[PDB]
Amino acid sequence: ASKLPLVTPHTQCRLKLLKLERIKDYLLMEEEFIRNQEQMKPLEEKQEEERSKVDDLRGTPMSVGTLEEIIDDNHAIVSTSVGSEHYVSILSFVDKDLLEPGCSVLLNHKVHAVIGVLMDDTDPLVTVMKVEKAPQETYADIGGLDNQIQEIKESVELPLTHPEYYEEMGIKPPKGVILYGPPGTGKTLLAKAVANQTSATFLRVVGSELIQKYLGDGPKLVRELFRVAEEHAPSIVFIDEIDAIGTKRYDSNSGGEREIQRTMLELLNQLDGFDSRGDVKVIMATNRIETLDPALIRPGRIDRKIEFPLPDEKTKKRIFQIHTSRMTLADDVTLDDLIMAKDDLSGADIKAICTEAGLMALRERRMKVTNEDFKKSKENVLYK
Amino acid sequence: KGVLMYGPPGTGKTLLARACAAQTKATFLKLAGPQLVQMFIGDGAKLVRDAFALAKEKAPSIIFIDELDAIGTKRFDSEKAGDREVQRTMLELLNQLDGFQPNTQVKVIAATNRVDILDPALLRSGRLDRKIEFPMPNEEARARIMQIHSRKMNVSPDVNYEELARCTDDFNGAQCKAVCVEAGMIALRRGATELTHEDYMEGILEVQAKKKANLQYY
Amino acid sequence: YDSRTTIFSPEGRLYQVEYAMEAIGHAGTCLGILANDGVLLAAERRNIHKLLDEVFFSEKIYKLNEDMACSVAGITSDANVLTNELRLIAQRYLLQYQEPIPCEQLVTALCDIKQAYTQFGGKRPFGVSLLYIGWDKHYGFQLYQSDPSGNYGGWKATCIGNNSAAAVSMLKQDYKEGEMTLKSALALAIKVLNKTMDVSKLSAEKVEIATLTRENGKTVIRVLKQKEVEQLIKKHEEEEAKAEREKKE
Amino acid sequence: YSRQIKQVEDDIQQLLKKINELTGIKESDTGLAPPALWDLAADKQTLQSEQPLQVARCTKIINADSEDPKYIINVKQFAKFVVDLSDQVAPTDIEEGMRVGVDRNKYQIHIPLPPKIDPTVTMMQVEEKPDVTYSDVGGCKEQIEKLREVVETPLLHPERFVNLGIEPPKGVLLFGPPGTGKTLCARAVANRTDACFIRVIGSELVQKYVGEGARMVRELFEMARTKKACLIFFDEIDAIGGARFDDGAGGDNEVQRTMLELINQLDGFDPRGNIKVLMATNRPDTLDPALMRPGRLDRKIEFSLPDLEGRTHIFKIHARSMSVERDIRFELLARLCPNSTGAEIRSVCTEAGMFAIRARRKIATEKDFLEAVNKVIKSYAKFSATPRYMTYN
Amino acid sequence: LDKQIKEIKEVIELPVKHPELFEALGIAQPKGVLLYGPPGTGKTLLARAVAHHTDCTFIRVSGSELVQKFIGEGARMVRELFVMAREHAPSIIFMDE
Amino acid sequence: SEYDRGVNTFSPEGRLFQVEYAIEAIKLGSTAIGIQTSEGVCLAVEKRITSPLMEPSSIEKIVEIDAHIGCAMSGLIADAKTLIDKARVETQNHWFTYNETMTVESVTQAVSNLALQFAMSRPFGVALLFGGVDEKGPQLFHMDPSGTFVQCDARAIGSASEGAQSSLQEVYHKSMTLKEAIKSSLIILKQVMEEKLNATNIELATVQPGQNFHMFTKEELEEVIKDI
Ligand SMILES: Nc1ncnc2c1ncn2[C@@H]1O[C@H](COP(=O)(O)OP(=O)(O)OP(=O)(O)O)[C@@H](O)[C@H]1O
Ligand SMILES: Nc1ncnc2c1ncn2[C@@H]1O[C@H](COP(=O)(O)OP(=O)(O)OP(=O)(O)O)[C@@H](O)[C@H]1O
Ligand SMILES: Nc1ncnc2c1ncn2[C@@H]1O[C@H](COP(=O)(O)OP(=O)(O)O)[C@@H](O)[C@H]1O
Ligand SMILES: Nc1ncnc2c1ncn2[C@@H]1O[C@H](COP(=O)(O)OP(=O)(O)O)[C@@H](O)[C@H]1O
């Protein structure tokens, strides 16, 4: 791997022909010398029989140890599974580069010497925290807003798709972004839309499960959450309903709001860690933003704040056209009457109305909706 | 049997522990405050009995613990919550110093910076005997202490130490040391030999650490 | 020693007035309909129990004067204090001016005094909402709805019940403009209390209806008798017998 | 030529992809490196790991004994017994609290005894300095110099202090406005240092159990005193201890033990000596007076909000990179944002650059900086994090 | 409970056995169902009987710590349940008040 | 906590912090400049217009205390309104009782007396610059929301006050004529205003020993703008 980066000419030219001929001749002498090394110096065969001798020197089982300290000169102390640690030697082929404390190592069964390092067999919570596939429709699905969409593309999507503009700007793209507003306006979905659009690794967990039953486990949890976030890729991390951590109290926690405060100070450290952060981007969403500690919201930790207003009626009819598109509607229905049917209605409300109208039509095995279906839908959905 | 000294932390008492260490030709054992807090259950009990058994082994010996208010927190009645390991540690401590098999071979020396946290059981009457307070250095002790700490400096013959202690009141031994060390700091900043008498006072405005505020309209 | 309860929200609103709104939200239910020939107001009285003496002659209805009447919802004690204040201010107007107050001037006086109550003093607002029905020579039959926030308006037919917006919605969908038709308005109120109240069969011992109408320059205010109420009720449920006849067609 | 461009390069680069793979026949590690370098010593120097050196597992010393050695050894929990180990080293390296490589039947001495500590604190040293300097931190110059003569001349030449016979100060607190302040200049300090720079974040010290934080504080002080001089950084000490305020049922004792034991560790009974520590928090009024005692908190660096000159200087500092029509009015920009913090100012220049790159422009203007500042300081003015924290309450 | 069993058959199994029926109308399949009423009043048994009739793996969790070891080593969150729940894709989630 | 700012709480060390917060709040306002010369007293303020809709005539800061004394305004204007009204009525009743015109120092002392008095519950977000003439000649007094009134020959207040004060230290001396002082003040104002100087962008007033309170030299200041 890592041969040479060159995509400059990309044409019928000696600036490509020369490069290709020189590199293929370099591969030619590489091939000729490696042919030299197993022809007049085969030893036995020197490619896999050496591997065979190592594998023979490798013990059949794995006395798996846990690493706790390092000594440079081909030995160290390792702790056994039963807990009786040993100061065993290492192998010459123990590939002394990916050794880290707390890691699984293949040891011998007799002398227990460090034979090799063990690849981790995945991790439980990396599977839980990582969203696998794209959820749903892209930015054509929202409708109505058309302003915060451009902003969040500028702050998140634009650094990835156009990593050139900031270079002639000589400037850094914004880091921390709050989404806020009345609930049901489309924050955690706008989250779904941007999750669909992006190609980077995506992380999602809600603040509600940041409470935990002991002391310090919350801050520790945030620690390896961000560790997983850093160790994979350029990543976008999404936390939803952060205000719950400050609003809803519980009894399952060992400590009260004190341990909550400790978790808060840890995450305030984590957003502005003086250690090298890198290309990890942060997206938040919270309806009750006023209850949060304002020092979390600061520039350097949070750069953008985006309000989500209640939808306008011209946006309401856009939502009507969007959501009722794939369903069969009769001519007797009218969206315009249903626009102002409620003074204070949300984007969840219209979807709930149309789904209830769909199931009400399914009650009588009917394919098309009628006006009375919405007329009976409105009080079922909203009015209780 | 049993001495406890208390007072505000800047008051100075530790130094007396070091001095009485220097003066006796006997075995001296020292404990940190929460050093007897282990989650192997009753390990602190083993630490207590082991320490006092070793103290019993050396017949001329004195036992000192600093900062007992970690362990001496008053016991209480509660449900579903409440630390109780420190109850075992404090109870075995109190019992082994006073209770069954009384012994006069070791003397407990007990430091703390507050008293109302302390459980009444340990401070009872004879589980510790002499309760001694540290008074604030009133007016001449400050000058004496800064003289002691500035002994290692080439003091110019123009100093009025009681003038300093009068103009620098409500200051304890730690900040009294802070006076001379930051005076040496500002002396090295200007660059000279040892300071003059007035050269201490620009130190003291550093030591008291007043909030910077352009309030001249007075 | 910590009670501010007078300051605006960090976003601009007031916590106290919205708490008052949702306090009215779980209160009792009363509704009114204007008509050209008069006005009706129907309520369900709460805590309907067999041990009540019921000797107050429709306690939910409060005759403010010989012409204009009231209904309240929220805290009963604050309602009593407020209605006494309405009697006081109205009859002070009668003392200063030898004619009845029309309808709206007393409403504006109430809105002023409740605004002053929710402006300063550091005391709790009165979580009561009122409906005012009356007659004047200036505009005939006039109806007003005074929320505890101080805002008021001239809705033709409305309610402050636990299902307020529900009955507002059925009224909006099913109102005929400019038709007095007092019997049909009574039927409208009957069907609205039918669909809104969770309890069924519409027991006349659970509801009360009061009527106001101009007659011989007197504006007579009556309370419908129990026999009349149950007769109107039974006529209402026998009215919905032909609705369930199309069925297949 | 243009659509024919893709006919010359492929004929050689696919062949390149063949021979590079054909050379790439030492791979598929899953616990290995290139075996020409991984097993570069795959000769007999593999067998000498076996017959010369034998297991020599860890141990723990318990007690000494008179005359002939006959020391007492713990394994970890296996057995607790008395042997003489061997004779290849003089019996003066044995002190209680140490770990020898000891066999199960011969009990060879092998190597002298290193101390055992948590791997977490070994990980906790950062060994990396961020690329921030003492030049790119402007607005706090007197705070800068106050921390210059704390972490330099003790680390540099000590003959000045020895000549004047003055022990240098140890306990230094640096503090400032919330959010803008101590953290990035602390990175600058770690940039300009030479010895180890032990990070401590206060939130991590709390554990599931009770008293472990005391143990790791003891361990970190021990591994610090293995060095001649080493720097200790403390962040957000407000959570690691406020005050002893216990009433009725026990409240927040689990952290109280940790803060008090570090207070015992800093002062009295042969202290760390040549170890420089420093702490920074978010609210100073809530700290304990015993932690506030000088000898642990000697210097009191306090950063405030810059008046105009620091604001102009930070405007210089963050904005030497963006395109402008030569002339600027940065001082009037600073006048436009009187009570404004440094990261806010960097956010203003960031959003000005974002407004410039909106449709097609390449250089922001003065009105672009106006469009930055009005939608930063007086459109996001609702929260701003300042007012309840300038009183630090 | 005839109207109740009618509507629950409308809500859960029709978007299991006939997803194209919902695709024919283009409406989202429901996910969350709330049952309320006095205790000891035809709930839990209904849920279990529906899960048995629908050939769906009935699962319920009380938040106890005995069952915790059957999900993960610590399993500090709850979402972890899914990595085994999706292994029995005909499944239904239930729990008490 | 909120008990810290109850009514009257000084500081951990030093005087009351809320009046210091008024001191920092006074920088959130348009600047003003005042020069006292033996030839006369000159005052100038910035209108700080935001749009061509509203008339600049209603954008009023400089007012007349009486026929020989004027003053500027800064900070919160409605806070200034009460103090200016009280100053006007106390000057008028002082003339009524004392059949004469007073000194500027009396008015300045009176507004300093009202400044501490807590309309209560906070100091007033306003700093005034009294200027005029009395029996001892030209007078210019500076006042602060803390109430410490003081005399000054040349002063700049409001936002950007210290840079303008530095330029005043650079250019002002004793033997400057009134025209010279006005020209220097306009020069400094030009280099401290963010927008280009217009006919109604600023406002000027002056007090001479001979003439009364001048009528703001309206439509004549374009002569002293265009020439420079
Ligand atoms: N503008 C909108 N048009 C249509 N549906 C919308 C709109 N805004 C929100 N919704 C609905 O809101 C629901 C939840 O979406 P999302 O995760 O983005 O959170 P949210 O709307 O902010 O609400 P909640 O906080 O209650 O989850 C979805 O069912 C979606 O249909
Ligand atoms: N003198 C300065 N010059 C330039 N930038 C500065 C200066 N002081 C602070 N900053 C800015 O402060 C921001 C981060 O502040 P920092 O984190 O160091 O402060 P803090 O008080 O420790 O708060 P926190 O760690 O809680 O965010 C950076 O964006 C940096 O540019
Ligand atoms: N003569 C003195 N009198 C009082 N205090 C002193 C004197 N000399 C030094 N000190 C200060 O008193 C401190 C003694 O420690 P002390 O405060 O008693 O410990 P603790 O607070 O843990 O009880 C020293 O750090 C020193 O700075
Ligand atoms: N409709 C019913 N027919 C028979 N038994 C019932 C019925 N409803 C409840 N039960 C009894 O109530 C018990 C539990 O009540 P159930 O409704 O299953 O759950 P919950 O107790 O949560 O309401 C069952 O053991 C059952 O015997």
Q: After which residues is chain F broken (C to N over 2.5 A)?
A: 118
Instruction: Report which ligand 2 atom has the smallest distance to the Cα of D178.
Output: 21
Q: How far is CA C70 from CA C29, C159, D323, in A?
A: 14, 13, 71
- CA of D370 from ligand 4 middle (Å) equals 69
Please tell me whether E39 is known to bind a ligand: yes
- CA of A84 from ligand 4 middle (Å) equals 55
Ordered alpha helix ranges (H), chain D? 10-23, 119-124, 141-148, 159-164, 182-192, 212-225, 237-240, 253-266, 309-318, 330-336, 342-356, 366-374, 387-390
Burial classification of residue D254, based on how many CB atoms lie within 10 Å of its CB (0-12 exposed, 13-18 middle, 19 or more buried) = buried
Q: How far is CA C98 from CA C91, C132, C141, in A?
A: 10, 21, 20
Query: Which residues of D sit in the known binding site?
Result: 176-183
Separation CA A372–CA A361 (nearest Å): 10
CB distance from C196 to chain A under 8 Å? no
Q: What is the CB-side half-sphere exposure of residue A269 using CA atoms within 13 A?
A: 25
CB distance from A290 to chain C under 8 Å? yes
Question: Residue D58: which of A34, A77, A300 has the nearest Cβ?
Answer: A77
3-state secondary structure of C108: helix
Minimal CA separation from C83 to chain A, in Å: 31
A246 alpha-carbon distance from chain centroid: 24
Instruction: Report which ligand 4 atom has the smallest distance to the Cα of E39.
Output: 23
Query: Which residues in chain C are closer than 8 Å to A341, comparing Cβ atoms?
Result: 169
- Helices A14-37 and D10-23: crossing angle in degrees, nearest 10, is 20
Question: Residue F194: which of D332, D338, D391 has the nearest Cβ?
Answer: D332
Q: Which of F20, F26, F27 to mutate to test the interface with D (most CBs of D within 10 A)?
A: F27
Q: Which amino acid is it at D392?
A: Y
- Helices B43-57 and B85-97: crossing angle in degrees, nearest 10, is 20
Question: Domain spans of chain F?
Answer: 4-228
Across the interface, do A113 and D50 touch by the CB < 8 Å criterion?
yes
Torsion over CA of C130, C131, C133 and C136, rounded to 10 degrees? 60
Task: Please give the biggest Cα pair distance in chain B.
Answer: 71
Report whether C207 contacts C43 (CB < 8 A): yes
Question: What backbone torsions phi and psi does residue A107 show, to the nearest 5 degrees?
Answer: -115, 175
Task: Give the residue among C246, B88, B149 at the shortest CA–CA distance from D294.
Answer: B149
Into how many domains does chain C fold?
1
Across the interface, do A119 and D349 touch by the CB < 8 Å criterion?
no
Any chains having at least 3 CB pairs less than 8 A from chain F are B, D
Q: Which of F10, F15, F16, F27 to mutate to test the interface with B (most CBs of B within 10 A)?
A: F15
- Decide which of 3.60.20.10, 3.20.20.150, 3.40.50.720, 3.40.50.12280 is the CATH code for F4-228: 3.60.20.10
Report whether C104 contacts C142 (CB < 8 A): yes
In A, minimum Cα distance to E81 occurs at: A128
Separation CA C3–CA E81 (nearest Å): 47
Separation CA A91–CA A75 (nearest Å): 8
Separation CA A372–CA F91 (nearest Å): 78
Atom 9, ligand 4: residue with shortest CA distance: E42
Separation CA A379–CA A374 (nearest Å): 9
Task: Give the residue among B107, B106, B104, B109 at the shortest CA–CA distance from B18.
Answer: B109
Task: Give the residue among D193, D204, D67 at the shortest CA–CA distance from D130.
Answer: D193
- Give the closest ligand to the alpha carbon of residue E36: 4
Across the interface, do A87 and D58 touch by the CB < 8 Å criterion?
yes
Across the interface, do A212 and E78 touch by the CB < 8 Å criterion?
no
Separation CA F84–CA F92 (nearest Å): 12
Q: Which of F10, F13, F18, F162 to mutate to test the interface with B (most CBs of B within 10 A)?
A: F13
Question: What backbone torsions phi and psi does residue B151 show, to the nearest 5 degrees?
Answer: -55, -35
Instruction: Say if ligand 3 is within 6 A of residue D268 CB.
Output: yes
Q: How far is CA A301 from CA A273, D141, D234, D345, D388, in A?
A: 10, 24, 20, 13, 18
Separation CA F102–CA F94 (nearest Å): 8
3-state secondary structure of A350: helix
Separation CA A271–CA A154 (nearest Å): 21
- Helices C226-239 and C182-196: crossing angle in degrees, nearest 10, is 80
Separation CA A355–CA A373 (nearest Å): 11
CB distance from B210 to chain F under 8 Å? yes
CB distance from D331 to chain F under 8 Å? yes
Separation CA C132–CA C112 (nearest Å): 16
Query: Which residues in chain E are closer than 8 Å to A354, comparing Cβ atoms?
Result: 27
Find tokens 């070891």 and name the residue.
E69
Residue C38: domain span: 1-245
CB distance from F144 to chain B under 8 Å? yes
Question: Residue D50: which of A47, A111, A295 has the nearest Cβ?
Answer: A111
Query: Ligand 1 test: best mutation among A189, A206, A320, most atoms within 8 Å of CB?
Result: A189
Are chains C and E in touch, 3+ Cβ pairs below 8 Å?
Answer: no
Across the interface, do B217 and F148 touch by the CB < 8 Å criterion?
yes
Across the interface, do E24 and A351 touch by the CB < 8 Å criterion?
no
Rg, C-alpha atoms of chain B: 23
Separation CA A30–CA A39 (nearest Å): 14
Torsion over CA of A48, A53, A54 and A60, rounded to 10 degrees? 110
Instruction: Say if ligand 2 is within 6 A of residue D276 CB.
Output: no
Query: Nominal resolution in Å?
Result: 4.3
Q: How far is CA C209 from CA A63, C32, D355, in A?
A: 88, 10, 65
Separation CA A189–CA A195 (nearest Å): 9
- Helices C164-173 and C182-196: crossing angle in degrees, nearest 10, is 140
Minimal CA separation from D210 to chain B, in Å: 7
CB distance from B184 to chain D under 8 Å? yes
- Give the closest ligand to the alpha carbon of residue B174: 3
> Residue D271 CB: number of other CB atoms within 10 A?
14
Question: Residue D385: which of A111, A113, A297 has the nearest Cβ?
Answer: A297
Separation CA D241–CA D260 (nearest Å): 8
Atom 17, ligand 3: residue with shortest CA distance: B12
Report whether D308 contacts D180 (CB < 8 A): no
- CA of D179 from ligand 2 middle (Å) equals 6
Across the interface, do B217 and F144 touch by the CB < 8 Å criterion?
yes
Q: What is the DSSP letter of A209?
A: G
Atom 5, ligand 4: residue with shortest CA distance: E42
Instruction: Say if ligand 3 is within 6 A of residue B32 CB.
Output: no
Task: Give the residue among A221, A220, A245 at the shortest CA–CA distance from A128.
Answer: A221
Any chains having at least 3 CB pairs less than 8 A from chain D are A, B, F
Residues belonging to chain A: 384
Separation CA D227–CA F148 (nearest Å): 58
Q: What CATH number is attached to the domain comprising C198?
A: 3.60.20.10
A-contacting residues of C 155-184, CB under 8 Å? Answer: 163, 165-166, 169, 173
Report whether C142 contacts C154 (CB < 8 A): yes
Across the interface, do A362 and E83 touch by the CB < 8 Å criterion?
no
Burial classification of residue F55, based on how many CB atoms lie within 10 Å of its CB (0-12 exposed, 13-18 middle, 19 or more buried) = exposed
Task: Give the residue among D193, D191, D173 at the shortest CA–CA distance from D182.
Answer: D173
- CA of B89 from ligand 2 middle (Å) equals 45
Across the interface, do A383 and C169 touch by the CB < 8 Å criterion?
yes
Across the interface, do A379 and C169 touch by the CB < 8 Å criterion?
yes
Query: Which residues in chain C are closer than 8 Å to A290, comparing Cβ atoms?
Result: 10-11
CB distance from A168 to chain D under 8 Å? yes
Separation CA C187–CA C236 (nearest Å): 6
3-state secondary structure of B202: helix
- CA of B205 from ligand 2 middle (Å) equals 27
3-state secondary structure of B109: strand
CB distance from A375 to chain C under 8 Å? yes
